[PDB]
Amino acid sequence: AGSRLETVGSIFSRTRDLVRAGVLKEKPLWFDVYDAFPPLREPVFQRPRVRYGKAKAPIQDIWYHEDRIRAKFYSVYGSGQRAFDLFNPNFKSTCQRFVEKYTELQKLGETDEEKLFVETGKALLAEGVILRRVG
Amino acid sequence: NVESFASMLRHSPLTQMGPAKDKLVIGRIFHIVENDLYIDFGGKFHCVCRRPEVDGEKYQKGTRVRLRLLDLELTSRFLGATTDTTVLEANAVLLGIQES
Amino acid sequence: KVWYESPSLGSHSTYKPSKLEFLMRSTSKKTRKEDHARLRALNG
Amino acid sequence: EDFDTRILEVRNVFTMTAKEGRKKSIRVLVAVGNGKGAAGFSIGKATDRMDAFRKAKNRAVHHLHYIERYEDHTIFHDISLRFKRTHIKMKKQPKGYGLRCHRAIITICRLIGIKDMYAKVSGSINMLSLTQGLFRGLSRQETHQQLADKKGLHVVEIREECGPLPIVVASPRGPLRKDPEPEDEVPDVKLDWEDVKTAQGMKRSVWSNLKRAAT
Amino acid sequence: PMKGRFPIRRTLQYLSQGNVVFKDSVKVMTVNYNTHGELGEGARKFVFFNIPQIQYK
Amino acid sequence: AFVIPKKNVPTSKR
Amino acid sequence: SNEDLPISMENPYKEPLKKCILCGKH
Amino acid sequence: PRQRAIQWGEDGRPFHYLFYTGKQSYYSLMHDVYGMLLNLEKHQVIGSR
Amino acid sequence: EDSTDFNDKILNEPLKHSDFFNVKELFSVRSLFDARVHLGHKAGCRHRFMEPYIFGSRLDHDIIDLEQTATHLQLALNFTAHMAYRKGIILFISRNRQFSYLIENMARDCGEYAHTRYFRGGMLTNARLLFGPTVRLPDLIIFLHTLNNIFEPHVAVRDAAKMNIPTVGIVDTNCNPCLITYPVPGNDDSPLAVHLYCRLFQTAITRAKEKRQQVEALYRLQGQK
Ligand code: FES
Ligand SMILES: [Mg+2]
């Protein structure tokens, strides 16, 4: 004797109720573990609905201040002929090296954007970095 | 002083790469089926590239290669569909082999 | 969709029109309603 | 052994077949229950009526609902729901009121263990819609303990037979709120004209409140 | 269900809950209210909820 | 309680 | 709170919309 | 007919890790053959029917 | 007389501790991040019930919040360890054929069960007919992939709930977690993610089985003397 109404409550609620009603003579092996360490959400069937009108998902695009510097760097100098190595968790691309220098010079008090971008390229050229302008 | 997830995500190479279109990345061949090379490049999905005609025998399991990325995940929504169809693979062009 | 029906449930299935698939197919299986469509459109 | 089975509908279904013409099969609807809140229903289909009975009753015992009962005799609150085109309006009632409901609801209520309830069925009177519509409404009723936990307040029952004595029926297990529930001068709840027309003495029916056998 | 918002207003029980029974002197009561404005909100609810009770009594 | 014809005889099994 | 959290802004990598060969010409 | 003895002990635990496939012997064979094909890669007619 | 002490010293004692098996030492947000567990599908594939567990979208690619994954993974690993400790039958289910071989080996090594093959109608809801009237069903089903190969929920998710079997499941951003008892938001595609999951569950299960033997043995030695 039991219940296969998987869309009515949860396996816990259905099992708990039938144990109270005496329908289940013994509790299942998992019941005491679920009770002691329950999930964050009780697993209850729900029907996913489609959004209409002015309803929008709450997920937000992930952006950072440095993304503005990256967009300009890719436009001006393009993607570096050096290849990304996404297996190394500490990999630094020419763009990231550019962003770090750009951040340092901003903290030194410079506030202009067009001037803070030209001085950064010079610093890297002095350090031996290859910056071939796309156009 | 335990690093947070927000910190890992900000400073990850995949985050720093920005858009993937026309980005050169280093991949690794992990599976081969005839002349189909399955290449992992650090993303969610592998890409599948045909063995190049020149120096085809140089491409073996473990061989590191240079790729030009086009899409991290090939997906499209077709008429009358509530969600997107995904082929569960990245789109990339195999350029050659990476050597030191 | 349009008056032309597009309800097929396995719409995300990756179409595999190859000579090898035909051999590895249930003999009972018969062409579905929207199975001809891909053939009519692939031939085009 | 603790479960009883009741038939709700026996139908003769006629299927037109390519070579054999009109064939006759049986569709049965049965309800099961132990009288202590555990009850279910199932459809049975077989060529022979007795086989359709065995299929339905054996299947129903594997699709049991648990139905919460107030004081093990009535529902916790008035339930008004629509399932497809069948409307069911149920009223919580005191002891001794009996089951004044559609005969099928009476049968199901005895299997669940409800002794006192009023119900009115409107719209389509489809036995299957009524059965599954009834079980849907009885399985989604909020108990007094759930109400106390949801609002973190005491649930206090006032009975006219007990005068002004406040009877706490449920208290929240978690902390107890300190802010009274807001007193909206006028509630924006939707009312049933049938209920209001009766309370105002404007409901005239020769068929209402007729003397009937104990149910 | 009963038509309109707050159908409770169209019940004899609600209308009999008015506590304002005017003295015999009162012959006419005019209500001047504004449909919009935060400072005239009580007057709108007075027209909406209580004028029926006043007239009933 | 009531009597319904039984499904089958247990000897009539694999 | 936390400095490394994402910040709200408009897509910096967004590409310009396409234009026809005669866009901007009389 | 050599129907395999009960495929679980007294505690009810099946003996084979692929029991719940219903075809444990067939899938145990496919698993062993698929595994051999993997190891070869890591390392690298008339007579019978 | 002696049974109540057994169930109290062995079966009820683990349930009085928040982490009886120390499964929090098995993983970290960094270890999850290195396995690419945070990488989800494109935003167009997102399931709306997975939105709570999503950190955001990075250029139309959803990112799974590993702070939640770590909390959900802790619960799932904790439940799995307790069920292995209680000698429950654990069944791993996945239809992703890239990992069928890996998952079958992990199940065999931990002493549990795997079903990575085509799932036939009624394995769970009609098991007595398929296996026999005395067949024991799984006490816990772990989905390493909750979707079948046509991108629909694996039928066993619904059928496990019908048979009142708790489910642990890796749920990617295009998956539906409503009926999964202990869902773990995480990447289900990348080999590094899948390999990590198999190590964690394999270790959690193997540790809980060894803990059960340690406690039993101690309870017997002390019983004689
Ligand atoms: S794109 Fe045609 S006028 Fe601008
Ligand atoms: Mg996935």
Side-chain angles (χ1 to χ4, degrees), chain B residues 4 6-7 10-11 18-19, chain G residues 2-6 13 15:
Chain B
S4 65
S7 302
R10 189 180 187 182
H11 308 303
Chain G
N2 185 4
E3 62 176 70
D4 292 327
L5 280 179
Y13 305 100
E15 298 84 357

XYZ file of all heavy atoms in Angstrom, chain B residues 4 6-7 10-11 18-19, chain G residues 2-6 13 15:
110
model
N 36.595 34.074 -2.596
C 35.186 33.902 -2.907
C 35.013 33.453 -4.353
O 35.933 33.534 -5.169
C 34.418 35.203 -2.669
O 34.851 36.218 -3.554
N 33.026 34.901 -6.542
C 33.052 36.095 -7.378
C 34.479 36.464 -7.764
O 34.718 36.993 -8.856
C 32.373 37.256 -6.655
N 35.440 36.202 -6.877
C 36.833 36.505 -7.185
C 37.401 35.522 -8.200
O 38.085 35.926 -9.146
C 37.665 36.489 -5.905
O 37.167 37.421 -4.964
N 35.982 36.467 -11.679
C 36.528 37.687 -12.264
C 37.899 37.446 -12.883
O 38.186 37.938 -13.981
C 36.609 38.782 -11.202
C 36.955 40.148 -11.754
C 37.021 41.192 -10.657
N 37.183 42.537 -11.202
C 37.302 43.635 -10.466
N 37.279 43.560 -9.141
N 37.444 44.814 -11.053
N 38.758 36.693 -12.198
C 40.147 36.524 -12.599
C 40.392 35.226 -13.359
O 41.547 34.815 -13.511
C 41.054 36.592 -11.371
C 40.822 37.799 -10.519
N 40.916 39.084 -11.007
C 40.494 37.918 -9.211
C 40.658 39.942 -10.037
N 40.399 39.260 -8.937
N 36.796 37.433 -22.781
C 35.725 38.185 -23.383
C 34.965 37.338 -24.383
O 34.785 36.132 -24.189
N 34.501 37.944 -25.474
C 33.837 37.155 -26.515
C 34.796 36.160 -27.144
O 35.995 36.414 -27.278
C 33.382 38.211 -27.530
C 33.366 39.493 -26.777
C 34.461 39.385 -25.770
N 31.567 43.402 -1.342
C 32.602 42.658 -2.044
C 32.945 43.396 -3.327
O 32.047 43.798 -4.075
C 32.141 41.228 -2.347
C 33.230 40.380 -2.971
O 34.369 40.821 -3.119
N 32.885 39.150 -3.335
N 34.243 43.574 -3.579
C 34.679 44.349 -4.736
C 34.599 43.555 -6.033
O 34.427 44.146 -7.103
C 36.111 44.841 -4.525
C 37.133 43.725 -4.392
C 38.549 44.249 -4.277
O 38.884 44.837 -3.227
O 39.326 44.072 -5.238
N 34.725 42.233 -5.963
C 34.796 41.401 -7.156
C 33.426 41.032 -7.710
O 33.357 40.318 -8.716
C 35.588 40.122 -6.861
C 37.059 40.393 -6.614
O 37.601 41.338 -7.225
O 37.676 39.658 -5.817
N 32.344 41.498 -7.095
C 31.021 41.186 -7.607
C 30.804 41.871 -8.956
O 31.378 42.929 -9.223
C 29.945 41.635 -6.623
C 29.680 40.720 -5.426
C 28.604 41.326 -4.544
C 29.278 39.320 -5.867
N 29.987 41.284 -9.831
C 29.688 41.945 -11.104
C 29.016 43.290 -10.885
O 28.379 43.535 -9.859
C 28.750 40.954 -11.800
C 29.150 39.639 -11.239
C 29.396 39.933 -9.789
N 31.305 44.832 -25.138
C 31.780 44.097 -26.300
C 30.750 44.054 -27.414
O 30.986 43.404 -28.436
C 32.156 42.664 -25.914
C 33.160 42.552 -24.795
C 32.752 42.276 -23.500
C 34.517 42.694 -25.037
C 33.663 42.161 -22.477
C 35.437 42.582 -24.017
C 35.002 42.314 -22.740
O 35.907 42.196 -21.712
N 28.747 44.607 -30.655
C 29.182 45.078 -31.955
C 28.134 46.009 -32.538
O 26.952 45.921 -32.193
C 29.411 43.900 -32.899
C 30.489 42.938 -32.441
C 29.974 41.916 -31.446
O 28.785 41.998 -31.072
O 30.757 41.033 -31.041
